[PDB]
């Protein structure tokens, strides 16, 4: 599958992209307000997901630092990034179909659009400005909104037991982003696509 990544951001940020164990394509690249990066995707692919990393330091070897979603200080990501970080998500080809997601299980440090640019699924979207709202005891000082499981690292925010219920904390990304993922047990706003469908991610999409 098809990915295009777009920075709309006024500020340049670092794609990412990873199924957890391996870089997805190239894996990370800078992106300019404006560049667009397009990937491709091997079919079949569960559990992928892209992400912005913002504030990026790299040497001529591709190591360095992120303030928010650093992957072990690699350009090139392998494995997921460090909280906070808007997720979009994606399983392909899974018995016929793919499976898209916006998550702020991990937090939000950059707004998202996570569309198909194939027919047959609508997109989703986080924009609303969680930063700038951001609860005093979940603010980054990296900058972005930490989850409370992050934080304060209890079973009932990071739902260890399987079970757990809303939270103040997730209330309030669901509350600006009802679209995304608000906590491990939130009613599932996945979007059904065709299998074989292609995408565009888009950061600061208004």
């Given at each position: 599958?098809?990915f295009?990544i777009?920075?709309?951001?006024?500020?340049?940020?670092?794609?990412?992209a990873?199924?957890?164990?391996?870089?997805?394509?190239?894996?990370?690249?800078?992106?300019?307000?404006?560049?667009?990066?397009?990937?491709?995707?091997?079919?079949?692919?569960?559990?992928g997901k892209i992400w912005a990393?913002?504030?990026?330091?790299?040497?001529?070897?591709?190591?360095?630092?992120?303030?928010?979603?650093?992957?072990?200080?690699?350009?090139?990501?392998?494995?997921?990034?460090?909280?906070?970080?808007t997720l979009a998500e994606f399983?392909?080809?899974?018995?016929?179909?793919?499976?898209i997601d916006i998550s702020?299980?991990?937090?939000?440090?950059?707004?998202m659009d996570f569309?198909?640019?194939?027919?047959?699924?609508?997109?989703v979207?986080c924009?609303?400005?969680?930063?700038?709202?951001?609860?005093?005891?979940?603010?980054?000082?990296?900058?972005?909104?930490?989850?409370?499981?992050?934080?304060?690292?209890?079973?009932?925010?990071?739902?260890?037991?399987?079970?757990?219920?809303?939270?103040?904390?997730?209330?309030?990304?669901?509350?600006?982003?009802?679209?995304?993922?608000?906590?491990?047990?939130?009613?599932?706003?996945?979007?059904?696509?065709?299998?074989?469908?292609?995408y565009?991610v888009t950061f600061?999409?208004?």
């Open positions: 599958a098809t295009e777009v920075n709309r951001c006024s500020y340049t940020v670092w794609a990412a990873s199924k957890g164990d391996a870089a997805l394509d190239a894996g990370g690249r800078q992106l300019n307000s404006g560049e667009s990066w397009t990937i491709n995707v091997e079919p079949g692919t569960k559990g990393r913002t504030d990026c330091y790299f040497d001529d070897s591709g190591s360095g630092i992120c303030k928010t979603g650093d992957c072990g200080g690699l350009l090139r990501c392998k494995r997921f990034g460090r909280p906070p970080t399983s392909l080809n899974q018995y016929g179909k793919d499976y702020n299980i991990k937090g939000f440090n950059v707004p569309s198909p640019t194939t027919r047959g699924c609508r997109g979207r924009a609303a400005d969680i930063v700038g709202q951001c609860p005093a005891k979940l603010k980054a000082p990296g900058g972005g909104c930490n989850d409370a499981c992050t934080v304060f690292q209890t079973s009932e925010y990071c739902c260890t037991t399987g079970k757990c219920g809303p939270t103040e904390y997730s209330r309030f990304f669901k509350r600006l982003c009802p679209d995304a993922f608000s906590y491990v047990l939130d009613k599932p706003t996945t979007v059904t696509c065709p299998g074989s469908s292609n565009r600061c999409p208004t």
